[model samples]
Target: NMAIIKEFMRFKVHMEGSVNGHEFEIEGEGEGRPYEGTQTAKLKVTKGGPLPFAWDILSPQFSKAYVKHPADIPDYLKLSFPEGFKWERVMNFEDGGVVTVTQDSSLQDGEFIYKVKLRGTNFPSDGPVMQKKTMGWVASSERMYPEDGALKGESKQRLKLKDGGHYDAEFWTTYKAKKPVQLPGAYNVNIKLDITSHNEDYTIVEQYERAEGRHSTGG
Candidate 1:
């Protein structure tokens, strides 16, 4: 007999102040049959200038990733997936790029596996705005999948300016499980940006972490 599972997750990211100096916070939660989890992320902008700047990541997890101004016009991180996982580059903008990944491991307990797509963008000229969005599913993977059984789904996110030098962003992701694979796990999605404009000196910072959990309740 085959078992099916469904899950949903949401992320809320907040940025305070202009590129000069800013504070950032991210909170997320997930719920669904067989899985549930929550995580928090925080960052601080230490310096800002026309050619160079620095920042730090603090809380739940800590790491320091930086970029030199003018010199590094475009900087990005490559998403790493398990071996045999297929991937493709989707989009590339002036300041950013995007990639998609799909995989089916015997370790994954499911008749049909899913494909994960990651989209990243950096708008330094647009105030050095940087962000990444992910969408996953089994159906979409079938067409791109290397195997027979594949599922499909999609997810997306966008960043917009808010009042008082603040920014608002939302993430909506969903997927179905042909069979129970794993209960819960977390992945780190980090982004780094460096930009310099002729008019004024400013800096933008954004980072993310995603987690999923599940529990069985007599199917």
Candidate 2:
């Protein structure tokens, strides 16, 4: 049998942009038997520069069925840029499952430069667990400027989930003006557990990317 309930997480984000500075608060919630979570992320421009970032999570429960306390699991949410851009973590909770990620991205030669890093822990209890961690940029073809657009040219990456583990991956994608256009603005980034065992069947645990906002801090 399946159950229905509401699970929510709130975030207070402060962003300092190379062009401007802004502060805002975002809230997200999920409802379902397996469970669902959502993130409303935003980016603000400051006097110093432009700040662009967003994330959201939506799925019924954790995809991986073998693990207990699925809601209590800690994940390191990350975003990467081409080059010249920088990111870092300001504050994080050791056990509370809360962390702050910041980024500074800029455009150069019609392309964006990004340098990203994460704070928080991506720890697992057992040996290395095979997981898929994906990320990509969002730009819309409809908008002449970045503000009037959508996410385009996205990509995904995989990682080995190890007990008490920490790791990072970086890459970039080019967009096309044709069909299958990347969704404008910021879309969803997801991470899932991919279980592969010869003797037994495995489960796929998926979570949406949530609570993305821009910050003035640099790495």
Candidate 3:
């Protein structure tokens, strides 16, 4: 029954564009990425720190399963392409996730440490475009949290996210549930990682992109 927090351990990504006055440079393997970027945190984890949402809701009991059913195929498209081009009628279920604590090799020359990845992915539903299939996105990382990972609004207005900011709240998945809820689930979760995002468009974008792409291992 251990929790992992390795997301920030050896993470890296490419970034472009700058927000506010602070331009974020590439950190770790974060070079050449776009939008959000990752940086090292000159801080340590403190058991029992500032909290954001209730941790209970984040449990499997409260977490819900979501399946993206195949999109409706219109007659025009069918006529547009032959049977070979018809979209497949399959369901697309979101990826499930978990929390854990482990060794952050990047943190201490491969020293054992604590880390976590609170997110999931959503791929394209059964369909046909002709070109190729698509990879999934962090659909649950932000969506499901808001669902019962839960949502409410304004509860996050005073919330702040920055490097060493600390995490202590409930994070719902933004599985595209209640609009108001999802609007901030990922925001709240990602903000806790910035040194000082300052709420500026660029800073917010940068921190978010980094947080979203945390030690996610890989897409």
lDDT: worst 10-residue window of model 3: 61-70
Give the TM-scores of the predictions, in the order they appear.
0.24, 0.22, 0.18
Q: Tell me model 1's lDDT, rounded to 2 decimals.
A: 0.23
- Expressed as tens digits, the lDDT of each residue in 1-219 for candidate 3 is 002222222333222211111122222221111122233322211222221222211112110111111123111111211111111111122222122111111122422222222221121223111111211112233221123433321111122223323222233222222112212222222222323221221212222223222222222
Candidate 2: tens digits of C-alpha lDDT, residues 175-200: 22212222233333233322211111
Sorting all predicted structures by lDDT, with the top scorer first, yields: 2, 1, 3
Q: How far off is model 1, as Cα RMSD? A: 16.6
lDDT of each: 0.23, 0.24, 0.21
Segments of candidate 3 deviating more than 4 angstroms: 1-9, 20-25, 29-219
In model 2, state the lDDT of residue 104.
41
**Each candidate: how many clashes?**
14, 32, 44
Please report how far candidate 3 places residue 212 from its true position, in Å: 15
State residue 152's C-alpha deviation in candidate 3, in Å: 12
**True-structure RMSD, every candidate:** 16.6, 20.4, 21.3
Residue 114 of model 2 has an lDDT of 29
